[PDB]
Design a protein around this ligand. Structure first.
Ligand SMILES: Nc1ccn([C@@H]2O[C@H](COP(=O)(O)OP(=O)(O)O)[C@@H](O)[C@H]2O)c(=O)n1
Ligand code: NA
Length: 136
């Protein structure tokens, strides 16, 4: 069984967290290494209709980093396809250790600013696709 799963997500606005830590260069490096792209310095938050638990899937945990004296926690990362209209963009879900949002909100990263390049406004619904599971 090659298992897929397509989920809908309502574009929502957040605390502006992702733009920050995605700027720092060991994250850039690890994401470049893990995902094969350098993500736009931000996360697109999406509200889902039900709790999302990254542990149900085969994620990648990044290591904690020490960056010029200050330390930083790693994140779990799960590559996905972002389905916006006819297109399929490569991206990933990122789950950081601590989060102000509910467990129905996920953060998406991608090569480009998706709002801009797909004229996304809050409330728009997009789909993300997840290949395999924890047992594949
Ligand atoms: N791949 C991405 C990442 C962020 N963004 C947007 O770029 C802005 C910067 O990301 P952010 O981390 O500040 O996200 P918010 O926390 O502001 O929602 C946010 O408005 C995101 O919605 C995007 O359009 N596409
Ligand atoms: Na965000």
């Amino acid at each position: 069984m090659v298992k897929l799963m397509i989920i809908e997500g309502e574009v929502v606005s957040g605390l502006g967290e992702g733009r920050y830590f995605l700027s720092l260069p060991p994250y850039k490096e690890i994401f470049k290494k893990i995902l094969g792209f350098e993500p736009y310095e931000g996360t697109l938050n999406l509200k889902l209709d039900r709790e999302f638990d990254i542990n149900k899937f085969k994620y990648i945990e990044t290591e904690d980093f020490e960056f010029n004296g200050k330390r930083f926690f790693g994140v779990k990362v799960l590559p996905i396809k972002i389905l916006i209209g006819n297109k399929k963009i490569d991206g990933a879900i990122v789950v950081p250790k601590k989060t102000y949002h509910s467990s129905e909100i996920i953060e998406i990263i991608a090569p480009m600013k998706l709002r801009e390049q797909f004229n996304l406004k809050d409330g728009d619904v997009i789909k993300i696709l997840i290949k395999g599971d924890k047992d594949e």
